[PDB]
Write a protein that binds this ligand. Structure first.
Ligand SMILES: COc1ccc(CC(=O)Nc2cn([C@H]3C[C@@H](O)C3)cn2)cc1
Length: 290
């Protein structure tokens, strides 16, 4: 750990804390996450091989005095801060589209390697001056676990959790990441979180109030899920034109497919990349004031 010079606290992610730091030998500026079971060590070691331009590179894994440090490529800003800074005028549609397109490329890559994120949220989406956006922390939830409260007692957000996770499916799939990304896509467009639940049942019921309480017609097998209760209120579905208003029919169609209830009907990252919404995708440069 002696090999790095801490510059500043970046934040309190899930898993421990994150600092901006400089490698004393290379001069490289990195992000150091302070998180150990052998199982976690081996799984974390395989993430070092998962390199893609839209995945935050894990540079090195350091285990000493049996604490764990993950060294990552550094990016100057996250999407949560960028959305907050863009709130008065909104992120231009072409930039929303580029960001969605790149995040689906990242997801398609990890998913083809059978690696899931499981806890996607705007804070783990990092951006640079060039117009790139990258996913951070892929594979970590499978390596260690995802808390109720962070290490700082901060409340882990439920806003982006897929309904099969909320209903107790133990063996959820790559579709949970598509759901979280859909929720993010909608938030970029409207400038308000889609489903801002403050409890697991509030999260589920906000989903139901917008997309309709799921049943056996739209989601075969849903009434047999572990946490499904027949006493759930039955709400009617709303139209997407009311849910993410400004967005055109190509975008609403894609969003609807990223938000299908049945994990098996939900679009894959690979199929989402071919959706007609990306017919005019481009790569604009964002306005970043660092
Ligand atoms: C000025 O204070 C900050 C500087 C940068 C940022 C954006 C950020 O979070 N940058 C980052 C984080 N990471 C790694 C840690 C692993 O979870 C992903 C790499 N770059 C936030 C705050």
């Amino acid at each position: 750990m002696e090999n790095f010079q801490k510059v500043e606290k970046i934040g309190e992610g899930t898993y421990g804390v994150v600092y901006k730091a400089r490698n004393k030998l290379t001069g490289e500026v990195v992000a150091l996450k302070k998180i150990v079971p052998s199982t976690a060590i081996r799984e974390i070691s395989l993430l070092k091989e998962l390199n893609h331009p839209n995945i935050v590179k894990l540079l090195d894994v350091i285990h000493t005095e049996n604490k764990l440090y993950l060294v990552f490529e550094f990016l100057h800003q996250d999407l949560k801060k960028f959305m907050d800074a863009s709130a008065l005028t909104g992120i231009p549609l072409p930039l929303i589209k580029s960001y969605l397109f790149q995040l689906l490329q990242g997801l398609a890559f990890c998913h083809s390697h059978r690696v899931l994120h499981r806890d996607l949220k705007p804070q783990n989406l990092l951006i640079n001056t060039e117009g790139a956006i990258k996913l951070a922390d892929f594979g970590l939830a499978r390596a260690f676990g995802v808390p109720v409260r962070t290490y700082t007692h901060e409340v882990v957000t439920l806003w982006y959790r897929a309904p099969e996770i909320l209903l107790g499916c133990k063996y959820y799939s790559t579709a949970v990441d598509i759901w979280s990304l859909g929720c993010i896509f909608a938030e970029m467009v409207t400038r308000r979180a889609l489903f801002p639940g403050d409890s697991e049942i509030d999260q589920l019921f906000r989903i139901f109030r917008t997309l309709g309480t799921p049943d056996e017609v739209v989601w075969p097998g849903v009434t047999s899920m572990p946490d499904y209760k027949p006493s759930f209120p039955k709400w009617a579905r709303q139209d997407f034109s009311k849910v993410v208003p400004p967005l055109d029919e190509d975008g609403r169609s894609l969003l609807s497919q990223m938000l299908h209830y049945d994990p098996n009907k939900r679009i894959s990252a690979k199929a989402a990349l071919a959706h007609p919404f990306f017919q005019d995708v481009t790569k604009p440069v964002p306005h970043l004031r660092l």
